[PDB]
């Protein structure tokens, strides 16, 4: 790698995240807040994905 | 100035160093180390450059 070559042999850096979408006991999440437990009533819900 | 830019589109910092020479005592010298004064011999000296 030189600082004079072109942007074909230019230094890039890659990372390759790999996420497994099988059923399992979920531990990585988003940052969305927790909201309360509403019941007996009609709710959209997202419980832990 | 694009990090993906040809190479001649690069930034270059430039100092250009310009050396006033004028008949005068000179202040900016080099590292070379002195020698003390012998006299009454043919000798070589660099004095003030």
Not at 7 to 13: A, D
Not at 25 to 30: D, E, H, N, R, S
Request: hydrophobic share 35%; with cysteine; glycine share 8%.
């Amino acid at each position: 790698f030189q600082p004079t070559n072109g942007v074909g042999y230019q230094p890039y850096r890659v990372v390759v995240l790999s996420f497994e979408l099988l059923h399992a006991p979920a531990t990585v999440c988003g940052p969305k807040k927790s909201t309360n437990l509403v019941k007996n009533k009609c709710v959209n819900f997202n419980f832990n994905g």
